[PDB]
Design a protein around this ligand. Structure first.
Ligand SMILES: Cc1cc2nc3c(=O)[nH]c(=O)nc-3n(C[C@H](O)[C@H](O)[C@H](O)COP(=O)(O)OP(=O)(O)OC[C@H]3O[C@@H](n4cnc5c(N)ncnc54)[C@H](O)[C@@H]3O)c2cc1C
Length: 489
């Protein structure tokens, strides 16, 4: 039986390992940290639990597909569907509580924004058709097509560009709404891959379909249960783990992978699958191999700055997912992507899992995950940025919720783009690999195979097909399909 080594226990690596296991490989995952899940990590601090990374759960069938590979194993993983997606607030007092029932969303949005129902209806149906077309056409495509060098392979993208909105920006399509608050609400979806609504293509209007047509869910135990259930499953089906052991080099011979090295020794495998960020994969682990320099130089997605606050009271106006919109979104993104700094009026996301699992906070308290969009680390003075952002975020919460939250903070943890970078070796602290700030960027990501080194594969959020849970999971599926194909040949 052949063996595979997976470099990193992120969601992509865990998924890949599970798939290779199902195929019959023996599998070992190396992890630099003393925990599994990478960005899907959690902490418990002074009476509060916090998810550290992903907070939004859509497309739960993609996780279930992994359990389905091992129908006999007993893994407790469940989730519920929510009636409400997000609460949205603005400085002028406007609040929109957004239903996951599309009929109710359209009616509510119509009244709250004084906007024609037909406009909202047509937009959501177009968002749906975009998703289904993109899924059918690009995410379900077969792997028949092969070759010795890199290729574009998407005349279909050009056929369908007018319908998908590939030649305009997200904001071009979102500016159809008359109320600018509604334009803003839908421009927010550019953050779902760390891009700007003013640059990312119009195909991204499909993103709200995920949470508004397909459901918004909450897993039992919070988001941490996603990586941990998968870790538990992996361990039960025989995947081996080497924790606190960073891979330092990927070994080859005669242009085929032979295994990896760590500070502790060398290990051989028939296959290597890296779940490490593609930049240090080349820069650090393949120092003797020629790097695809343009791929590695693609613009980096945005990062984040997060404050985790225990809060000594309740806010009945807040649900699980809440947004306090900046009064000037265009400036917000300009700072982030053009100047690598922070605008003074931020869009603040407040996530509160204690609304779903009351054990996540003391009785009558809340566990606030408080996040603003942020540039990656390019040498800024992060100490000053954090100090400044804190005061602006507190100012934002006074404008929108009419409370001085500083009187209620009982404990604080902070995560910056430096912390993000250190935690998981994500280059620049970018949350989603390369940004998607033009129509080529998706088609310019590193593939899941490697054209120089046979039997070396790549999985996760910095490579094809993209950042975020659903796409990282597809990364692993595609990687495993490739390998099975190669076996058959
Ligand atoms: C704050 C935040 C919020 C987010 N929210 C969302 C969300 O709501 N929805 C969403 O879809 N996505 C979200 N994301 C993004 C999402 O978390 C990632 O894109 C995705 O989970 C990353 O998966 P991955 O497979 O790339 O693995 P990663 O999570 O990046 O982890 C990779 C693993 O590899 C390990 N590793 C690296 N180098 C080595 C080495 N040399 N040796 C051994 N091990 C190594 C790392 O330590 C890490 O454990 C969020 C990200 C952040 C930071």
């Amino acid at each position: 039986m052949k063996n595979a080594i997976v470099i990193g226990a992120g969601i992509g690596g865990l998924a890949a390992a599970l798939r290779l296991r199902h195929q019959g490989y023996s599998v070992t995952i190396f992890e630099k940290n003393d925990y599994a899940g990478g960005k899907l990590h959690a902490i418990e601090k002074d009476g509060y639990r916090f998810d550290l990374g992903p907070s939004l759960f859509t497309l739960p069938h993609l996780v279930e597909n992994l359990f389905a590979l091992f129908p006999e194993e007993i893994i407790d993983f469940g989730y519920k569907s929510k009636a409400i997606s997000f609460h949205y607030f603005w400085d002028d007092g406007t609040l929109f509580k957004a239903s996951t029932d599309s009929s109710q969303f359209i009616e509510d949005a119509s009244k709250v924004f004084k906007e024609e129902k037909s406009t909202i209806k047509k937009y959501l149906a177009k968002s749906k058709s975009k998703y289904e077309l993109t899924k059918s056409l690009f995410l379900e495509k077969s792997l028949h097509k092969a070759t010795t060098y890199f290729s574009l392979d998407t005349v279909k993208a050009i056929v369908h560009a007018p319908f998908l909105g590939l030649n305009n920006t997200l904001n071009d399509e979102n500016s159809k709404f008359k109320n600018p608050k509604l334009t803003q609400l839908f421009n927010r979806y550019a953050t779902y891959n760390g891009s700007s609504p003013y640059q990312t293509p119009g195909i991204m209007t499909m993103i709200p379909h995920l949470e508004l047509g397909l459901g918004t869910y909450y897993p039992d135990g919070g988001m941490h249960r996603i990586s941990q259930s998968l870790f538990e499953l992996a361990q039960k089906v025989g995947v081996k783990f080497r924790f606190r052991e960073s891979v330092t080099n990927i070994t080859t011979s005669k242009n085929k992978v032979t295994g990896v090295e760590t500070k502790n020794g060398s290990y051989l495998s028939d296959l290597v699958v890296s779940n490490m960020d593609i930049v240090p994969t080349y820069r650090n682990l393949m120092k003797d191999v020629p790097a695809p320099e343009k791929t590695l130089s693609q613009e980096r997605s945005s990062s984040a700055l997060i404050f985790y606050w225990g809060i000594d009271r309740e806010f009945p106006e807040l649900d699980l997912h809440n947004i306090l919109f900046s009064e000037d979104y265009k400036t917000e993104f300009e700072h982030i992507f053009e100047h690598k700094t922070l605008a003074q009026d931020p869009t603040v996301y407040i996530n509160i899992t204690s609304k779903e699992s009351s054990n996540d906070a003391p009785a009558g308290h809340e566990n606030w995950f408080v996040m603003i969009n942020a540039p990656g680390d390019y040498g800024q003075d992060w100490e000053q940025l954090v100090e400044e952002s804190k005061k602006q975020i507190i100012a934002k919460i006074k404008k929108c919720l009419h409370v001085d939250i500083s009187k209620h903070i009982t404990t604080e943890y902070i995560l910056t783009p430096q912390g993000i970078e250190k935690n998981t070796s994500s280059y620049r602290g970018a949350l989603y690999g390369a940004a998607s700030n033009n129509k080529f960027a998706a088609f310019l990501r590193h593939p899941n195979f490697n054209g120089k080194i046979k039997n070396l594969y790549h999985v996760g959020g910095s490579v094809h097909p993209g950042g975020g849970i659903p796409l990282c999971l597809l990364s692993a599926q595609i990687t495993a399909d490739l390998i099975q194909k190669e076996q058959l040949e």
